[PDB]
Symmetry: C2
Subunit: 206 residues, 2 copies
Amino acid sequence: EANIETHGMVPMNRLTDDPRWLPAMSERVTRMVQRDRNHPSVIIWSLGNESGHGANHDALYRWIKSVDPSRPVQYEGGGADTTATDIICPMYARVDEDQPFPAVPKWSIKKWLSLPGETRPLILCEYAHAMGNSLGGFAKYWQAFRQYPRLQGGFVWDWVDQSLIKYDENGNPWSAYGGDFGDTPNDRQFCMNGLVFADRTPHPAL
Amino acid sequence: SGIFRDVSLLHKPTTQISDFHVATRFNDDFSRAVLEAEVQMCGELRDYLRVTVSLWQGETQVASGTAPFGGEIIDERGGYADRVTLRLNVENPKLWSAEIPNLYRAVVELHTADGTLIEAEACDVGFREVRIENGLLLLNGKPLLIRGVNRHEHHPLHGQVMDEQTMVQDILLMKQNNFNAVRCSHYPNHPLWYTLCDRYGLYVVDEANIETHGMVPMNRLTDDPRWLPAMSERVTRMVQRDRNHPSVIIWSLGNESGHGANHDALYRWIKSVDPSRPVQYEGGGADTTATDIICPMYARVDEDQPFPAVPKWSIKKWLSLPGETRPLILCEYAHAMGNSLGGFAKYWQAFRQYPRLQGGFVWDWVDQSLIKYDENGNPWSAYGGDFGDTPNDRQFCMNGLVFADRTPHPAL
Ligand code: NA
Ligand code: NA
Ligand code: NA
Ligand code: NA
């Protein structure tokens, strides 16, 4: 995945729809493909994450398709099914329940496949948000993946808690999140979404 | 068996209207319509002969056209000298639908050039466009949601003889219980039925009288070209009879006859002769090349039924199978045998959530019970083998939302 996320912009595609930022975005995509295109484990290129959908995405999608046709390109931003992705790749679309947000709805993944004119496979780039005591309803996803041919799985969010170690005054280490370093404004425990702890000990969800 | 519909004498002149077709074409917002009436004559062609086609709404004549016989050039040999096609413009036509069944009256006059009437024929015209576009069945540009029921022609005292009073009672009860569509399971109905559906507002699936369900396999006759002439008359004579009715929105090739090459042939025949209506056919797995609509019977909402060559996928799953783009409308679902219709709300949740799930037709409208009489004279409702008839299938003829006297079951 290219090193491009402009999530804090308002709207999200404010830079990715601007041709002044097309040269900077183009180097994040093209230098990734030039570096990693011989690795067999890389099967899909991603244009980045949470940067809306802009014309720069469409351009860099087509660049990758011209330079390396051996790998699909995916990109979730701007509604998970834009012209910049070969795969319907939503984040946290539910199995049976629609979430009808105004310009970027998250249809239920069963419903999304049969929308008129939709033919791509669907692979969730993020699903089953493993924040703390979580992964409830995980079996519903895997029932749906096994039943529906174009539901070809997805990527759990995510592998490892992003906790950092701090030390108490007696020397004992402890796992720290968010604003435990004086860092403000922070987002507290939202960095810990892992199936495993930061020392790679498994959570029960694993 | 027997002579179970009307018998009539019709006197025509020797020079006569022998056929007429009414088509309606629209612009993209349906604000201008062209009525195209093709009229064919039989008998002596005279140069004085004329056809006038007039369009009437209530009492006001909206469009008229007068032309001698003579079609446009068709091929190297010419055109039909015994046909004439009139095109009438209608500005802002009142469109037909099941919600608002706006009807015009078309009159087709065969008359001489000095104005002497030879013979008139006529039909009700409903201006509507039925089309499948981007995987959805549209009526007048809007995606339909089919609230349908299958309806046999059954009367508990008269058997299979239909009368206007029972037809009107069925249509009223259907509309009063929020049905908008009826499937003619599984044959062309009495001719009055389509008139009443035109006037009251029901979408009709008009179905050829072809079911070979008892064959082994089911397509043993329908895949045999020796039976193609017999099947071809059941389809072509239905389309020639009923193609001017606006309530008929879909043609059906029949029911439960497998999938044979004769189905593919007759599908393509209808598509060539009448492109204004989709063709559907369930047999051979509900999604063959002989149907424009995925039209399974009793496919479940969420549960697959993976039968070996004719699986019934869950209707949500069926829509997204690779290469599948058609709308899905169950030709039969929610089998209303006795105390039934459990799980009916699951279907209607699925129909409302999924755009290409455009509804279906409940099996079925009326119990096929017949009345017998006990020794003291009291009537009672009889099924299956209550007439000494064997082999029989007992109470399986009673699958209705209403009793045979049209009293509602609780499922209605
Ligand atoms: Na799958
Ligand atoms: Na997070
Ligand atoms: Na629907
Ligand atoms: Na039955």
